[PDB]
């Protein structure tokens, strides 16, 4: 019996593949200062920024906090701390994908 | 298997 | 006592520096002929560019 | 120290 001939389906599929976008990434320093007054026990949002798809951030934080003057060297320990979170926009607005 | 035109449909 | 924190003034300055222009220099020959008649003692401008 | 935007001012 004869042997079957190929179909063109694979070459037709290949012609339909769009090229990748050429992005023009760059590296730069985005340093910023922030100054404030606050009281203990509250969660204070001291840093806020917007990250794009394909960003990379490396963050160093310097802090100087001064306590307003105590009466005596009170005996209890007292930590200052800073915690950072990522929040995708689609978690905070249902229409974010439809907006895009 | 790459990024097709008109978005993804398998 | 505590240690001071930095200012952002240097990074803000750096964002304001414009890039250098890309000039597209090239080398070529700009040969020219000039023909004239003149008399002695005068300053004759034979070449101008 | 480079070419600033808006022309030079020290």
The helix/strand order of chain A is: HH
Helix content of chain A: 10-25%
User: What sort of overall outline of chain A do the alpha carbons produce when their principal axes are compared?
Assistant: elongated
Strand content of chain B: under 5%
Organism (chains B, D): Escherichia phage EC6098
Protein name (chains B, D): Putative DNA binding protein
Subcellular location (chain C): Virion
Family (chain C): Belongs to the microviridae F protein family.
Written description of the protein model:
The structure is cut from a larger assembly and holds 2 copies of chain A and 2 copies of chain B (10 residues). By secondary structure, chain A is largely without helices or strands. In chain A, 11% of the residues lie in helices and 0% in strands. The longest helix of chain A has 7 residues, at 9-15. Chain B is flat and about 15 Å long. Chain B is largely without helices or strands. The chains are: A little secondary structure (100), B little secondary structure (10). The interface between A and B is small, with 4 and 4 residues.
Write the layout of secondary structure elements.
This is part of a larger assembly, with 2 copies of chain A and 2 copies of chain B (10 residues).
Chain A: H1 9-15, H2 96-99
Chain B: no helix or strand
PDB class: virus
Keywords: Capsid, virus
Entry title: Gokushovirus EC6098
Protein traits:
part of a larger assembly, 4 chains, A: 100 residues, little secondary structure, 2 helices, 11% helix, B: 10 residues, 0% strand, Major capsid protein (chain A)
